[PDB]
Write a protein that binds this ligand. Sequence first.
Ligand SMILES: [Mg+2]
Ligand SMILES: [Mg+2]
Ligand SMILES: [Mg+2]
Ligand SMILES: [Mg+2]
Ligand SMILES: [Mg+2]
Ligand SMILES: [Mg+2]
Ligand SMILES: [Mg+2]
Ligand SMILES: [Mg+2]
Ligand SMILES: [Mg+2]
Ligand SMILES: [Mg+2]
Ligand SMILES: [Mg+2]
Ligand SMILES: [Mg+2]
Ligand SMILES: [Mg+2]
Ligand SMILES: [Mg+2]
Ligand SMILES: [Mg+2]
Ligand SMILES: [Mg+2]
Ligand SMILES: [Mg+2]
Ligand SMILES: [Mg+2]
Ligand SMILES: [Mg+2]
Ligand SMILES: [Mg+2]
Ligand SMILES: [Mg+2]
Ligand SMILES: [Mg+2]
Ligand SMILES: [Mg+2]
Ligand SMILES: [Mg+2]
Lengths: 120, 185, 144, 43
Amino acid sequence: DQFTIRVKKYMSNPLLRRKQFALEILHPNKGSVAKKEVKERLAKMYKLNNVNTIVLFGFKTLFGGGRTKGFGLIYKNVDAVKKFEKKYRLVREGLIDKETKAGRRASKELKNRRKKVRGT
Amino acid sequence: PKSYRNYSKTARNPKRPFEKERLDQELKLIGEYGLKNKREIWRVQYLLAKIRSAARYLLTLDEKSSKRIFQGEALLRRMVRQGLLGENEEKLDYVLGLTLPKLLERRLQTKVFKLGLAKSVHHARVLIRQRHIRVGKQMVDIPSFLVRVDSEKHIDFATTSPFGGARPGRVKRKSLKKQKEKTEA
Amino acid sequence: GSGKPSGLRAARKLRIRRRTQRWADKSYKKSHLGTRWKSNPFRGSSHAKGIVVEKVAIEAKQPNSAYRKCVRVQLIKNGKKITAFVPGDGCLNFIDENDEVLVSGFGRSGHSVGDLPGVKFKVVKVARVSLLALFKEKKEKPRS
Amino acid sequence: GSLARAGKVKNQTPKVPKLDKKKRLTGRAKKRQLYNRRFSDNG
RNA sequence: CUUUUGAUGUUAGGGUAUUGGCCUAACAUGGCUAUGACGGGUAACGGGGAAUUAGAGUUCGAUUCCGGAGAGGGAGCCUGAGAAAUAGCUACCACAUCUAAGGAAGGCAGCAGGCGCGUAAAUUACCCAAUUCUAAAGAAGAGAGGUAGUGACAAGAAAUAACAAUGCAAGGUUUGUAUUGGAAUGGUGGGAAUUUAAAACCUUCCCAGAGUAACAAUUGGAGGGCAAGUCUGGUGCCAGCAGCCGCGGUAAUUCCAGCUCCAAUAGCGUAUAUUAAAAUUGUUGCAGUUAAAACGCUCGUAGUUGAAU
Ligand SMILES: [Mg+2]
Ligand SMILES: [Mg+2]
Ligand SMILES: [Mg+2]
Ligand SMILES: [Mg+2]
Ligand SMILES: [Mg+2]
Ligand SMILES: [Mg+2]
Ligand SMILES: [Mg+2]
Ligand SMILES: [Mg+2]
Ligand SMILES: [Mg+2]
Ligand SMILES: [Mg+2]
Ligand SMILES: [Mg+2]
Ligand SMILES: [Mg+2]
Ligand SMILES: [Mg+2]
Ligand SMILES: [Mg+2]
Ligand SMILES: [Mg+2]
Ligand SMILES: [Mg+2]
Ligand SMILES: [Mg+2]
Ligand SMILES: [Mg+2]
Ligand SMILES: [Mg+2]
Ligand SMILES: [Mg+2]
Ligand SMILES: [Mg+2]
Ligand SMILES: [Mg+2]
Ligand SMILES: [Mg+2]
Ligand SMILES: [Mg+2]
């Protein structure tokens, strides 16, 4: 709970619908803070009614504990996030999941197409 | 393809491997500044040597040649930062006059030994490796670390050490405490 | 006078003489003649694999008196027969009369070494176990 | 001649096994010890 | 040497996307060469570079980029803006697969993987997340590419204790070193936090968690060169070692051991090559009475060198 987030090279970006930033979490002594808490803090900071326009990533915890760098992304609305975030990040967040086993026996299947009028 | 992450040898070997005097000198150095190999010494020599070479090159050029003034000046500044020269001896002829002691002095372990903290050099080294010591915010667990004069004053036991205020937090002390508790109950 | 020309425009002569003369240097000749690849068992290599043909003794140079234990082996690479001295206090018997030996140089490029007359090679592995290891014995035992 | 003698002397010698020793120091510690032996108290 | 077979040129053409003996015809007799032509060799792709150098240099450069070339071997085409394409086609040669014997398809010097060759080299892994390309161009593909796996190729950092008591030691009270004993901590094991396309590592925190801290450092040496034993047994010109000189013929400081020591140390040996050491290829920078080496002598073309003004 004793952890300040200082937010660096913050950058509004209306080409996308997001605020980018780098993000340092000072948490002296009591090491490591989970993403959820950080997100909450961010929300508190920027009024930001709903928590899940925030996407955090790249949280490296640095040698010795105590500090911890990351990258914050904050979208305008969930729609925006849906539109231009890559799927993996969305999945991680928990907005969606397709657990689709396309695999790369997909590739094999594709190359097994020689003459098509094939459902099969 | 190959990666582009280029890499470099930090230490040249001797040349004449069983010269007595040199060996003795190396041993003395090891003794004084708590070093693990001759490799460390060699590394530091290399570090020194590059600088020395640069200085020599600069001196071959005349004053108010652009290169000499710029690069030489930069070198001097770097030396000053490192804690090799200071106030009196900042003229580029002086950066030649550096020896190994000058460099070893600025190793973190040596500094630690100097500024109280541990009874010995060896002790200091072990402290450093055992995750105590910090050099301005950042902990550091490599004794080699050449402390710059900007961050000499900001050396003490880290925030998270047992003897920098963050619980006995050991296999030892904690265990002892537990034992005591058990005995009590 | 110097011997050499020291003209400003002399370079041709200077180069050319050096080019011809280099070949008097023995080492240079050894490096740059093509007979290296032809007339050498290892054929420009560190080691070679040879099956053994004959466990054999070689009497030493006159002052010293020993019969040094060699192994006459046939290189698989080249079909070349060569004697290879086997180290160790009792390491002739550690090899078989037909064993796939891995043989190295002796330390002096081609040139022969020490007491031995004209054995330029040091067997240093038998059936993939290291001769040195076998000699030590605490490390390994010959698999067969 | 004789390949019979190959491995004479080694075979002859009596196998005295190693023995227990105080596990030696290594790296820095060893160096320190060496230094002490050479220069510090003897000097 | 090149020239019937275009060698060198001129003319006219043909051809090309265009120039051109590029090809044809006609006509000249040229062209290159001791400043090495033409052959031969290269264990030769070129270059950017690499190693090693005080400075010169010497060697290397298959190999991150640029260029060239090739897709078993030659040759030939089609398509197309671009191919003389090879996961296009035709043919032959050389390999080789299926076949009901009629035919048919095939080309890893793409990625893995296998046999062979060999001294000599990793997984038939996961993914398009990043970097890019292609497309009807966010949204699909990509063994391009990336991520892990194997990996002592190299490269970097760095544990294997430290500290304090007495006991013992030496020094002019302090350093050093045998008993104890509380502190420190990685490693290792398990959870998370994070990381990531998903994992794994990294780091991070929390539980576990050293005293013979068995969580056990090796490698190669101890005559010299060369740092370190004329310590103990064994062998007895044998076995062996020894890069070199040498050691061994019953005191071996050299063999085989044990102990002790020394070096470098998570590395350390051996081999082959290479650079330096090599002013032992000498431009800097060698030597030539006698050590290797002044042509028997002079003339002489190229070559190099050339008074002053
Ligand atoms: Mg800790
Ligand atoms: Mg004609
Ligand atoms: Mg070639
Ligand atoms: Mg190349
Ligand atoms: Mg080749
Ligand atoms: Mg092939
Ligand atoms: Mg083709
Ligand atoms: Mg293919
Ligand atoms: Mg073909
Ligand atoms: Mg392959
Ligand atoms: Mg290999
Ligand atoms: Mg992409
Ligand atoms: Mg690839
Ligand atoms: Mg000596
Ligand atoms: Mg040897
Ligand atoms: Mg004896
Ligand atoms: Mg011995
Ligand atoms: Mg050389
Ligand atoms: Mg030189
Ligand atoms: Mg000479
Ligand atoms: Mg003479
Ligand atoms: Mg004469
Ligand atoms: Mg003339
Ligand atoms: Mg003149």
